Amino acid sequence: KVFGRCELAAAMKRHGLDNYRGYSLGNWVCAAKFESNFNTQATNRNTDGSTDYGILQINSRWWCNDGRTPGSRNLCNIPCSALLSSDITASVNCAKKIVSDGNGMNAWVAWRNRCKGTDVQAWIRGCRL
């Protein structure tokens, strides 16, 4: 599914991501925008051969299982394929474990280089939340 910007903010909020670990909702929407262009089916191979899946481009080296990333972990205990679903539940629950891991949202390269320190509230501006 390709979410609409406010439609994504709403699902994120309903799923408890707004100010999760101190990150306002706009930070999450901004990250999804640059990681996946709000597309739950987005997949991108990384240099190390691991792959990033879903709206929040969660990586197979540590978080989900895809059967083709040697030496990797599956810390969210789920098939990477479940991160491509129309329903973002699995991706949110997993993003919550990632962001609690110590480096906060800096775990998302796109958030650090394109959202961090920018006007992220702009991403939820105009949305009925």
Which residues are at the interface with Na ion (CB under 5 A)?
Answer: 60, 65, 69, 72, 74
Q: Which part of the chain contacts Cl ion (CB under 5 A), choosing from 12-20, 32-40, 45-53, 103-111?
A: 103-111
Out of 7, 18, 52, 119, pick the active-site residue.
52
What is the 3-state secondary structure of 40-106?
CCCEEECCCCCEEECCCCEECCCCCECCCCCCCCCCCCCEHHHHHCCCCHHHHHHHHHHHHCCCHHH
Q: How far is the CB of 12 from Na ion (least distance, A)?
A: 24
Interaction mask 59-88, Cl ion, x per CB under 5 A: --------x-x--x----------------
Asked if 63 contacts 74 with a C-beta cutoff of 8 angstroms, the reply is yes
Asked if 79 contacts 65 with a C-beta cutoff of 8 angstroms, the reply is yes
Q: How far is the CB of 54 from Na ion (least distance, A)?
A: 14
Instruction: Give the binding site for Cl ion (CB under 5 A).
Output: 67, 69, 72, 104
